[PDB]
Amino acid sequence: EAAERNPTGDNARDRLLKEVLALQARINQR
Amino acid sequence: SGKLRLYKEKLEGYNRFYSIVKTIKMVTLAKYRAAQGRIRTRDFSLRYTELAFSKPQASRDAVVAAKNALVYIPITTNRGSCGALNSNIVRCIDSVVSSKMVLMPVGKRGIDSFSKLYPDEFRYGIINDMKESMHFGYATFVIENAYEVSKDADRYQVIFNRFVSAGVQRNAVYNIPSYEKWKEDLADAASSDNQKNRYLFANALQNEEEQLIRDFFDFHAALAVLNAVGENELSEQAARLVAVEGQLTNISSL
Amino acid sequence: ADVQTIPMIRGARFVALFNQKQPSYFMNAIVSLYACLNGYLDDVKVQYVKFYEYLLVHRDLGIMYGTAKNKFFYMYVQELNYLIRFFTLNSPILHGELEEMLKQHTHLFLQHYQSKMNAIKSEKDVKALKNLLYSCKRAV
């Protein structure tokens, strides 16, 4: 609570991985 | 020279390996030749069992709303070399892992695989010596242990291998809802127009006394277990013959 | 070749202790082997054996946490190598304090380090731990 008071390349890999995982899951569904 | 004889010793070992494996093929072929009879005499015992339990339900609503132990009874072979049957069953069980999952696998390979894989969920397993024929008593032993593992269980599932043909062994599922949920569905199939095919069957059970219904439920549950183990054995011997041939040819190429 | 029996529990840890990159001082090597021999590393995971050895040699948990009651036997006293080499570790002069130091080091290590190590799930923390343990192989 007291923490609240006072206080990109890798993203592309994560984005691609999420998309691939989504596609592999979608094909399973139907 | 030692180097030359090193190869000779290496090839000497492969020769005995071929003989022993060929001996395995002889054993399995005899068991498969005598287990081929069930193919003639199957597909008729479980007719009203279908009405009792055949419910093509969705695969999500069944497991999502689990408020009580879901017991699974995968069928696995005692000895290895069967093929991918055990591996697929594990994949089929891993795909249904949940908080309420309890496992009572059958066979040493199932126990060994699941004791390591799922130590906490695994309670204990059943082992049968492949000395006598798969009989009713063995199925009754599977069911009694399953109830004692989780009497307040939402469902008891059996995951086994169906022997479609000599080269086709699919994975089949018998889902058995406990008494409370079954009699509730049996009550709706009787009164309501829904579940027409089960209307006459359900009303013919509600007329009788309860103990008879409970005996009916247990009896048909045992039959489903008996069919699964019987099929899982026939798929096992058929698969081993296929696998053993592969090992023979691999040991011939070497 | 053919079950967590004592020989199999300690055998793996001895093998892990045999990985080295630089020659080890006699005092440090003998002490570590004695510890693994008398079961002081049974509760320590195999992956963390090198980290345990590094703290034992290049650190002193008892002094860090103020629980060290030994009079002379400390791993930072390099002159003890020749006393060990004369009397043996299983001698009344050195045996009593040796066991006390190992007992304190094991208890402190398990409590303050292994518990946190087994509680790491963050990818950043996991990677940091992996670097630490590999470095400990090449340090002690």
Partner: protein
């Protein structure tokens, strides 16, 4: 990843007659006598079948109403339209009778009455009766009495004919 249900591979389903339908005059009962997932008879047209349920004996002929019967250790008779009688003996199970003209008798064990031996049956009754005398507790006595009931039924079944 959906798995087939084990009943999908079975191609002989049960046909139920819609209640709002015309009646048919049937002269044959399609019997399916089964033991331990093995059919001794399959959709066999018969004249009649006699079964012993807990309440008593039922003589099932074509067109019998829908009913479920809990069998007891006893003989089971099948009479064909030709005029031939085949007698089995069952140790238990269930009999499902459908108004469409079918009867599926699933038994744990179904053995032709010829196979059974009266001499073996008789001496077993004597031994079990002695066992009942030495039965330790109430549970043991109940189990022994289960055996005697089956044995006496077998003995009486064979003495009948």
């Amino acid at each position: 990843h959906d798995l087939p249900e084990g009943f999908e591979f079975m191609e002989h389903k049960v046909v139920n007659k819609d209640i709002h339908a015309p009646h048919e005059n049937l002269e044959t009962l399609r019997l399916t006598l089964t033991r331990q997932d093995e059919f001794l008879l399959r959709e066999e047209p018969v004249k009649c079948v006699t079964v012993t349920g807990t309440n008593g004996e039922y003589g099932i002929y074509p067109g019998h109403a829908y009913k479920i019967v809990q069998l007891n250790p006893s003989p089971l008779t099948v009479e064909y339209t030709d005029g031939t009688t085949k007698k089995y003996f069952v140790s238990g199970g269930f009999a499902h009778i459908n108004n469409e003209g079918s009867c599926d008798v699933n038994t744990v064990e179904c053995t032709l009455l010829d196979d059974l031996d009266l001499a073996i049956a008789e001496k077993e009754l004597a031994a079990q009766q002695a066992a009942l005398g030495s039965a330790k507790d109430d549970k043991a006595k109940s189990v022994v009495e289960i055996r005697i009931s089956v044995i006496e039924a077998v003995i009486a079944a064979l003495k009948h004919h």
